[PDB]
Design a binder for this molecule. Structure first.
Ligand SMILES: [Zn+2]
Length: 377
């Protein structure tokens, strides 16, 4: 009566926080109609889950409902969270993801909050000093350490009015299971919309083995390419050239993506994929204020952290994402029984598309992009 996959606690928690991530993606995309969207919401959800350790029942419950924990009956959801983080940030996954809680200067933190925070989330609080330049330098150094320097350093100054600041950072550069032949990469058309076309570097595999399916309701075609480390990327490509992907965005949930994944079928296709090297640095404070989290910014109860009243004032996100032709090996070339019939398909990502990076074992959303322009911001 229940999908055995989502009965596994880590998989259920992955589904919950990834549903938070798809919600956040929808909010950001609705406010970015003409710009790329690039998010790794797991880091933001992790910052929020960690902060909930320091919250009393009311605020804790608000946070937990935003993270879809209300559908989970677990003895220790924070231990499950530690398991999930250890699984999806292992070396093979090529994903760096880090979360930080930053407190106003001179705040006195209870050790009873520091302890479970370190135990389950592997991070410790950072209390500001009041020197903007040194606080910015220290945050940049923390990001450099966590992301192996693969993210750009920030120049935005730390505001003076900060009670609680959450920081979520993520970087991904993966390796396809099946490399692209760099000799076939060339400049090709990318249709930004019905009336605009640009030239972008485009990787090509004319005989690509991928998992495919066409959704006529959403009027789009879906392809799945595996990556090393037991991950995959699922592309949603509209059938007509358009920047309007809202109907596709509305359907994205952990369970719906699991369904799509299960229903794709193996095929051979003429595949073109644009090279990607994207970055993002921004504030998601207002998006969260729109996501039933407003109470964190007025008068929440974080008395498990400190006796002085504190509140959320800022939530920052920095993300970097990259794929090129790099891959593990070439097509397997296995022995086959003779067959007469082929079923040719074309999958050309030469127009705005959405992509979702997912961990195969847990189903966790690790990265999501609306690519209106592969060249970047
Ligand atoms: Zn024949």
């Amino acid at each position: 009566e229940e999908d055995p996959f989502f009965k596994v606690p880590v998989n259920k928690l992955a589904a919950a926080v990834s549903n938070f991530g798809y919600d956040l993606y929808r909010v950001r995309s609705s406010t970015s109609p003409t710009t790329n969207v690039l998010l790794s919401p797991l880091s933001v959800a992790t910052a929020l889950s960690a902060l909930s350790l320091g919250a009393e029942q009311r605020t804790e419950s608000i946070i937990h409902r935003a993270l879809y924990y209300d559908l989970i009956s677990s003895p220790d959801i924070h231990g499950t969270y530690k398991e999930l983080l250890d699984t999806v940030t292992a070396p093979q996954k090529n994903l760096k993801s880090a979360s930080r809680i930053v407190f106003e200067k001179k705040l006195r933190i209870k050790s009873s909050f520091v302890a479970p925070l370190e135990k389950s989330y592997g991070t410790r609080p950072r209390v500001l000093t009041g020197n903007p330049r040194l606080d910015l330098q220290e945050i940049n150094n923390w990001v450099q350490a966590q992301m192996k320097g693969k993210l750009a350093r920030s120049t935005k100054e730390i505001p003076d009015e900060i009670s609680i600041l959450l920081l979520g950072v993520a970087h991904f550069k993966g390796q396809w299971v099946t490399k692209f032949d760099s000799r076939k990469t060339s400049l090709e058309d990318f249709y930004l919309d019905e009336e605009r076309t640009v030239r972008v570097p485009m990787m090509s595999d004319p005989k690509a083995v991928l998992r495919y399916g066409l959704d006529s309701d959403l009027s789009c075609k879906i392809a799945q390419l595996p990556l090393t480390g037991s991950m995959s990327i699922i592309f949603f490509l509209p059938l007509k050239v358009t920047q309007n992907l809202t109907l596709i965005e509305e359907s994205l949930t952990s369970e719906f993506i699991h369904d799509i994944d299960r229903e794709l079928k193996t095929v051979q296709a003429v595949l073109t994929v644009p090279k990607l090297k994207l970055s993002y640095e921004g504030e998601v404070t207002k998006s969260l204020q729109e996501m039933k989290l407003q109470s964190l910014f007025d008068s929440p109860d974080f008395s498990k952290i400190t006796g002085k009243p504190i509140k959320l004032t800022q939530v920052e996100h920095r993300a970097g994402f990259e794929w090129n032709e790099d891959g593990a090996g070439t097509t397997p070339s296995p022995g086959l029984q003779p067959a007469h019939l082929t079923f040719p398909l074309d999958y050309h990502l030469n127009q705005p598309f959405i992509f979702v990076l997912r961990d195969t074992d847990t189903g966790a959303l690790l990265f999501i992009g609306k690519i209106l322009d592969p060249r970047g911001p």
